[PDB]
Design a protein around this ligand. Sequence first.
Ligand SMILES: *[C@@H]1O[C@H](CO)[C@@H](O[C@@H]2O[C@H](CO)[C@@H](O[C@@H]3O[C@H](CO[C@H]4O[C@H](CO[C@H]5O[C@H](CO)[C@@H](O)[C@H](O)[C@@H]5O[C@H]5O[C@H](CO)[C@@H](O)[C@H](O)[C@@H]5O)[C@@H](O)[C@H](O[C@H]5O[C@H](CO)[C@@H](O)[C@H](O)[C@@H]5O)[C@@H]4O)[C@@H](O)[C@H](O[C@H]4O[C@H](CO)[C@@H](O)[C@H](O)[C@@H]4O[C@H]4O[C@H](CO)[C@@H](O)[C@H](O)[C@@H]4O[C@H]4O[C@H](CO)[C@@H](O)[C@H](O)[C@@H]4O)[C@@H]3O)[C@H](O)[C@H]2NC(C)=O)[C@H](O)[C@H]1NC(C)=O
Ligand SMILES: *[C@@H]1O[C@H](CO)[C@@H](O[C@@H]2O[C@H](CO)[C@@H](O[C@@H]3O[C@H](CO)[C@@H](O)[C@H](O[C@H]4O[C@H](CO)[C@@H](O)[C@H](O)[C@@H]4O[C@H]4O[C@H](CO)[C@@H](O)[C@H](O)[C@@H]4O[C@H]4O[C@H](CO)[C@@H](O)[C@H](O)[C@@H]4O)[C@@H]3O)[C@H](O)[C@H]2NC(C)=O)[C@H](O)[C@H]1NC(C)=O
Ligand SMILES: *[C@@H]1O[C@H](CO)[C@@H](O[C@@H]2O[C@H](CO)[C@@H](O[C@@H]3O[C@H](CO)[C@@H](O)[C@H](O[C@H]4O[C@H](CO)[C@@H](O)[C@H](O)[C@@H]4O)[C@@H]3O)[C@H](O)[C@H]2NC(C)=O)[C@H](O)[C@H]1NC(C)=O
Ligand SMILES: *[C@@H]1O[C@H](CO)[C@@H](O[C@@H]2O[C@H](CO)[C@@H](O[C@@H]3O[C@H](CO)[C@@H](O)[C@H](O)[C@@H]3O)[C@H](O)[C@H]2NC(C)=O)[C@H](O)[C@H]1NC(C)=O
Ligand SMILES: *[C@@H]1O[C@H](CO)[C@@H](O[C@@H]2O[C@H](CO)[C@@H](O)[C@H](O)[C@H]2NC(C)=O)[C@H](O)[C@H]1NC(C)=O
Ligand SMILES: *[C@@H]1O[C@H](CO)[C@@H](O[C@@H]2O[C@H](CO)[C@@H](O)[C@H](O)[C@H]2NC(C)=O)[C@H](O)[C@H]1NC(C)=O
Ligand SMILES: *[C@@H]1O[C@H](CO)[C@@H](O)[C@H](O)[C@H]1NC(C)=O
Ligand SMILES: *[C@@H]1O[C@H](CO)[C@@H](O)[C@H](O)[C@H]1NC(C)=O
Ligand SMILES: *[C@@H]1O[C@H](CO)[C@@H](O)[C@H](O)[C@H]1NC(C)=O
Ligand SMILES: *[C@@H]1O[C@H](CO)[C@@H](O)[C@H](O)[C@H]1NC(C)=O
Lengths: 106, 38, 53, 47, 129
Amino acid sequence: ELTQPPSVSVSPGQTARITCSGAPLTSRFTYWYRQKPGQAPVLIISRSSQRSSGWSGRFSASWSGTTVTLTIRGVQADDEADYYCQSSDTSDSYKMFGGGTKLTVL
Amino acid sequence: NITDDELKNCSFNMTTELRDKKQKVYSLFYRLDVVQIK
Amino acid sequence: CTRPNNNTVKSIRIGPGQAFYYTGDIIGDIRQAHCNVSKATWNETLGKVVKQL
Amino acid sequence: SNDSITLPCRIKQIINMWQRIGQAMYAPPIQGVIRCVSNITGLILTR
Amino acid sequence: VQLRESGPGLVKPSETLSLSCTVSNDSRPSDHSWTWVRQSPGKALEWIGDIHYNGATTYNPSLRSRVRIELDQSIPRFSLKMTSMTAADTGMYYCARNAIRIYGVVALGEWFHYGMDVWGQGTAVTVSS
Ligand SMILES: *[C@@H]1O[C@H](CO)[C@@H](O[C@@H]2O[C@H](CO)[C@@H](O[C@@H]3O[C@H](CO[C@H]4O[C@H](CO[C@H]5O[C@H](CO)[C@@H](O)[C@H](O)[C@@H]5O[C@H]5O[C@H](CO)[C@@H](O)[C@H](O)[C@@H]5O)[C@@H](O)[C@H](O[C@H]5O[C@H](CO)[C@@H](O)[C@H](O)[C@@H]5O)[C@@H]4O)[C@@H](O)[C@H](O[C@H]4O[C@H](CO)[C@@H](O)[C@H](O)[C@@H]4O[C@H]4O[C@H](CO)[C@@H](O)[C@H](O)[C@@H]4O[C@H]4O[C@H](CO)[C@@H](O)[C@H](O)[C@@H]4O)[C@@H]3O)[C@H](O)[C@H]2NC(C)=O)[C@H](O)[C@H]1NC(C)=O
Ligand SMILES: *[C@@H]1O[C@H](CO)[C@@H](O[C@@H]2O[C@H](CO)[C@@H](O[C@@H]3O[C@H](CO)[C@@H](O)[C@H](O[C@H]4O[C@H](CO)[C@@H](O)[C@H](O)[C@@H]4O[C@H]4O[C@H](CO)[C@@H](O)[C@H](O)[C@@H]4O[C@H]4O[C@H](CO)[C@@H](O)[C@H](O)[C@@H]4O)[C@@H]3O)[C@H](O)[C@H]2NC(C)=O)[C@H](O)[C@H]1NC(C)=O
Ligand SMILES: *[C@@H]1O[C@H](CO)[C@@H](O[C@@H]2O[C@H](CO)[C@@H](O[C@@H]3O[C@H](CO)[C@@H](O)[C@H](O[C@H]4O[C@H](CO)[C@@H](O)[C@H](O)[C@@H]4O)[C@@H]3O)[C@H](O)[C@H]2NC(C)=O)[C@H](O)[C@H]1NC(C)=O
Ligand SMILES: *[C@@H]1O[C@H](CO)[C@@H](O[C@@H]2O[C@H](CO)[C@@H](O[C@@H]3O[C@H](CO)[C@@H](O)[C@H](O)[C@@H]3O)[C@H](O)[C@H]2NC(C)=O)[C@H](O)[C@H]1NC(C)=O
Ligand SMILES: *[C@@H]1O[C@H](CO)[C@@H](O[C@@H]2O[C@H](CO)[C@@H](O)[C@H](O)[C@H]2NC(C)=O)[C@H](O)[C@H]1NC(C)=O
Ligand SMILES: *[C@@H]1O[C@H](CO)[C@@H](O[C@@H]2O[C@H](CO)[C@@H](O)[C@H](O)[C@H]2NC(C)=O)[C@H](O)[C@H]1NC(C)=O
Ligand SMILES: *[C@@H]1O[C@H](CO)[C@@H](O)[C@H](O)[C@H]1NC(C)=O
Ligand SMILES: *[C@@H]1O[C@H](CO)[C@@H](O)[C@H](O)[C@H]1NC(C)=O
Ligand SMILES: *[C@@H]1O[C@H](CO)[C@@H](O)[C@H](O)[C@H]1NC(C)=O
Ligand SMILES: *[C@@H]1O[C@H](CO)[C@@H](O)[C@H](O)[C@H]1NC(C)=O
């Protein structure tokens, strides 16, 4: 499956980073979502064509080994939610989710 | 930058117009025109 | 038939007046070369063959 | 009908024309895109 | 693009499940993927299955023995058939569009998933008596 930190604490204004780890992340592509409590998930990082870094706007992500770092630039107090990395298997048969990671804002 | 998966980005040395000066460039090739001996 | 790759070709000189070309880079939509064949046209062909065999 | 099967086609650059081993001709890659149209006239089958 | 779910609200245990998700304002409804994903309270997400308009479906293999997803395309509304409802499956369920863009021959696999852009209403799936 996937591997995440359970919760990440940071003050506003700094740069919070979340490391989604897991065995399928050797090869496959990683999603990202945002879900407010009591409401729907929101796709936050999608992708373009393959050699195009997906998309770089307000967030970014790098890759090193089986780890994928979720860079959050410019933390404020309004983005408080729970976050999720998503991928599939290298065999391309089924789709799994991350464990879930709470944003803790000071 | 990351994805899954016929091209090879190749480190490559070569001569120049002058006899001694070398040339470190890069190019692309396919699968079936290159062999493992990386 | 097609090779749908927008591709950049660069040129170098390897020695005393000997040019050389190489695939520099592609602009970015990695595809695979392929050929289309009209399906119903092709089945109409093979019925003629077994008619003689 | 209104259908089109599609074949996977590969690209090589180092050829050996008519199996004459020793001669190796290089393919210069060309710019733009590739389109060529051809009829089908002849077939080879082997019992 | 609009979407809306459809649910009964209260379901008894050991019975079945009939859900659907109606889609409108979609200029190309025919070339996306359509999927159900559920969520338990205070838990992670939980993928269920997916359907494409060719008719090819995949499923979560652990849940595969009790589920089925089917489809109407005239009304852009795809269904959901879960059987044998248990109280552990009480949660918040979602329909979603998983987009795919195309860089060439579909039959040769020259496509990629864009990502799941549009998410459903959510439904308080209550398995109780
Ligand atoms: C052998 O036979 C084969 C047939 O079996 C044949 O295969 C065919 O090959 C060709 C090419 O080889 C394939 O053509 C590709 O088709 C892709 C899909 O095109 C379809 O879909 C678009 C999408 O339209 C959406 O939006 C409009 C509103 O604007 C709606 O009205 C639509 O209904 C649809 O809406 C859906 O999507 C929305 C967005 O998610 C949803 O919100 C919404 O709810 C809807 O569900 C249609 O528009 C197309 O119809 C016509 O419209 C456009 C308008 O300009 C015309 O230009 C076009 O020609 C159509 O006539 C069509 O129905 C295309 O994406 C793809 O084009 C890309 O690549 C080319 C070349 O690189 C680019 O020039 C082009 O600009 C596109 O590049 C963009 O997108 C790619 C994404 O991968 C990026 O790589 C690229 O960087 C660029 O991205 C940029 O723009 C994006 C959007 O603009 C943006 O998101 C990016 O972030 C970035 O900014 C190409 O045309 C064809 O599918 C094959 N067919 C099959 C069946 O396989 C083969 O060729 C034959 N071979 C031979 C030799 O004969
Ligand atoms: C000689 O020719 C004959 C006929 O001309 C050939 O027989 C045919 O062979 C076909 C493939 O070998 C076979 O098609 C399959 O049939 C089943 C049941 O009908 C169907 O489910 C299959 O569809 C899957 O596979 C195709 C191609 O792989 C995919 O395009 C399709 O979407 C389905 O794949 C999905 O499920 C897989 C399950 O493991 C996933 O791995 C895969 O990634 C994919 O998931 C994606 O797509 C889903 C749909 O979009 C989506 O929800 C998901 O999220 C992912 O995006 C396929 O149609 C024919 O049944 C068979 N016909 C007969 C009569 O036997 C024969 O092979 C030829 N001879 C030889 C020797 O090759
Ligand atoms: C550069 O890219 C190429 C391809 O773009 C890549 O070559 C491929 O590497 C993979 C991984 O080493 C090979 O994948 C294998 O394929 C078979 C069938 O497809 C699978 O069954 C294999 O899975 C088994 O083996 C794994 C080995 O650790 C196990 O982890 C796994 O659980 C299974 O037991 C495996 O995925 C693929 O064969 C090659 N391709 C070729 C043509 O050889 C190459 O690795 C990339 N370069 C680098 C430096 O990584
Ligand atoms: C291979 O490619 C050629 C062209 O690259 C294809 O020829 C094209 O075929 C289509 C239909 O088969 C023609 O469209 C029709 O044109 C008539 C004439 O105006 C129009 O009235 C019809 O409504 C229809 O649009 C198209 O004109 C024709 N183009 C050329 C240049 O010949 C051919 O079909 C392709 N074959 C395969 C197997 O893909
Ligand atoms: C192959 O790898 C080389 C690594 O050096 C890439 O070359 C660099 O590309 C970046 C941006 O693409 C440039 O800013 C650098 O100047 C390049 N380096 C040199 C020495 O020129 C190259 O792009 C890769 N090939 C492909 C097709 O991406
Ligand atoms: C493939 O063969 C067909 C035979 O029907 C060719 O079509 C005709 O060719 C003659 C001479 O080449 C022309 O005078 C006619 O005007 C053609 N008719 C049509 C409807 O095109 C066709 O030219 C051949 N293909 C190629 C690429 O030459
Ligand atoms: C992705 O790679 C491209 C070229 O390979 C580079 O220009 C870009 O900075 C990279 N982006 C990230 C986020 O690493
Ligand atoms: C190319 O040459 C340089 C020095 O001339 C050397 O350091 C480098 O390792 C060479 N590249 C390869 C791939 O051997
Ligand atoms: C390929 O991309 C270049 C830009 O890098 C552009 O000038 C050229 O027109 C493109 N090729 C085609 C066939 O459009
Ligand atoms: C569909 O929604 C878009 C926004 O995504 C809106 O601009 C458009 O007016 C809607 N279509 C209709 C027919 O109202």
